[PDB]
């Protein structure tokens, strides 16, 4: 009957839908590789889809995927075993080298832009009309790391203009330079901002931005990666 036909057709549709969905989700990261960067022998049963091209706004070009994959940066790790599937040890200081949970991707070294082509994120001092509208204003608070020592002080908030939200705290260190801290990695308290991921001595090693009133996607990745990496790599200097 008709119900039998409908249910049989539906499962055929669903198998086709799943094939389409899985292949769409292979537009990044594939083909799979061995640990040494060469193509793996076993790619599995789904082939790569035909490329699509996204047209990016404001003259930034296009992206075509899938396309040739590469890291575009050195990776300071080495095998710890003679066969596949074991961890790779940092060959230096993993925080400075940007590996493990301190990792960063070689994103475009330009700022993300809003829909009018202005910088998406700006220090609040240069964002006209923007101010703190609720909650404890962090500006002026001392900033404490997980060693319980003061690492610096908050001198601004960087804000997402189109979405109206706090993205980073700008923190000045003892030497008078500043660093960005991801808003999602600080706790604003009544008398301080507390940063569990980093001990005070690691603040200076947070990657710097090249221009003081904008941050490029590359730089946001280095900064956020470095701070998150501290949860694993500053664990010896943390504490209670």
């Amino acid at each position: 009957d008709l119900a039998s036909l409908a249910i049989y057709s539906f499962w055929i549709f669903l198998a086709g839908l799943i094939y389409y969905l899985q292949t769409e989700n292979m537009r990044e990261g594939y083909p799979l590789e061995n640990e040494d960067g060469t193509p793996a022998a076993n790619q599995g049963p789904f082939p790569l889809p035909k490329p699509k091209t996204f047209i990016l706004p404001h003259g930034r070009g296009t992206l075509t995927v899938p396309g040739p994959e590469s890291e575009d940066r050195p990776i300071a790790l080495a095998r710890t075993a003679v066969s596949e599937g074991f961890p790779h040890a940092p060959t230096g200081d993993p925080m400075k080298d940007g590996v493990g949970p301190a990792s960063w991707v070689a994103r475009r070294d330009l700022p993300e832009l809003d829909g009018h082509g202005h910088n998406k994120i700006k220090p609040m001092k240069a964002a006209a009309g923007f101010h703190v509208s609720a909650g404890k204003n962090p500006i002026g608070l001392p900033v404490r790391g997980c060693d319980l020592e003061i690492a610096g002080k908050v001198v601004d908030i960087w804000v997402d203009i189109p979405e109206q939200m706090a993205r980073f705290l700008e923190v000045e260190l003892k030497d008078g330079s500043t660093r960005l801290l991801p808003m999602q990695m600080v706790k604003v308290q009544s008398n301080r901002v507390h940063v569990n991921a980093l001990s005070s001595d690691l603040f200076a090693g947070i990657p710097t931005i090249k221009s003081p009133t904008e941050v490029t996607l590359l730089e946001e990745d280095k900064i956020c990666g470095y701070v998150a990496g501290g949860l694993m790599y500053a664990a010896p200097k943390r504490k209670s």
Partner: protein, 281 residues
């Protein structure tokens, strides 16, 4: 085999138990101590289900069914073939699910991400436990739990529901359903919105999140925003499960009559109880 970008993240560390002893992968899968624990609990549980099938006399996946002890056993143990297997399989399931969650926690730690995913999963675990552990214990017997079979668990859902009349009238169930439906509505809208911006009309440039906010303001006068919508899907999905668990935990324990009758507390409030007219006068 590794995704093209994967190697830099495969460093040592993050384990909760065992240091480096189980810090490795098998293909794509991370192991860890809790991966070993998962494999053990799951393997045992699956073996025991296969045995329960031999004892039941079938291999058809649509008939295999492991039933908990009948009610006469209360909270005691029961022979294997008469509820005991269920009891052990359930311990194994709990073991495997909790172990899955803790293994997710290890993966979070190695990757330097938040713990939100295992936290969310724990809500599914708590719903499962409400049905097989908490509610049975409070009601005084394992036999109030559901059986492990594809169609038999549906018989349990139907029989349990209609024990209280039309189960639609359980008010915590109404709230639960509201969250499930709202969740799906939000999921449809979120997926469509992102895709409608990433994949604009032919030859146009990708839209921005400013356009996604704009689309929603234009449509309904409000846009929750890109951070908000992810908060929202999380809240709606977890609230739906919270209220599911709640609607069951109260049923057969604090309320055990027909759910339709619970609503009489509103109808009978003194100020309008006796006014003639309407449906209830």
């Amino acid at each position: 085999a590794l995704l093209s970008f994967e190697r830099k993240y495969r460093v040592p560390g993050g384990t909760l138990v065992g240091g480096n002893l189980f810090d490795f992968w098998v293909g794509p899968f991370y192991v860890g101590f809790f991966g070993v624990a998962t494999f053990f609990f799951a393997a045992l549980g699956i073996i025991l289900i296969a045995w329960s099938a031999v004892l039941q006399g079938t291999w058809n996946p649509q008939l295999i069914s492991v039933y908990p002890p009948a009610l006469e056993y209360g909270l005691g143990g029961a022979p294997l073939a008469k509820g005991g297997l269920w009891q052990i399989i359930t311990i194994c399931a709990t073991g495997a699910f909790v172990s899955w969650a803790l293994r997710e926690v290890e993966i979070c730690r190695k990757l330097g991400i938040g713990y939100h995913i295992p936290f969310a999963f724990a809500f599914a675990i708590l719903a499962y436990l409400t049905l097989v552990l908490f509610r049975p214990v409070m009601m005084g017997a394992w036999g109030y739990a559901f059986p492990y079979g594809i169609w038999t668990h549906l018989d349990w859902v139907s029989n349990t529901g209609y024990t209280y009349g039309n189960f639609h009238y359980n008010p915590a169930h109404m709230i639960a359903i509201s969250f499930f439906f709202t969740n799906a509505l939000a999921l449809a809208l979120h997926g469509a919105l992102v895709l409608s911006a990433a994949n604009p009309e032919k030859g146009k440039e990708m839209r921005t999140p400013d356009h996604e906010d704009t689309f929603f303001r234009d449509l309904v006068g409000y846009s929750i925003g890109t951070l908000g919508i992810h908060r929202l899907g999380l809240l709606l999905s977890l609230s739906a499960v919270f209220f599911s668990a709640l609607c069951m935990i109260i049923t057969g324990t604090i309320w055990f009559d027909q759910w339709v009758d619970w609503w009489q507390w509103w109808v009978k409030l003194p100020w309008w109880a006796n006014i003639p007219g309407g449906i209830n006068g």
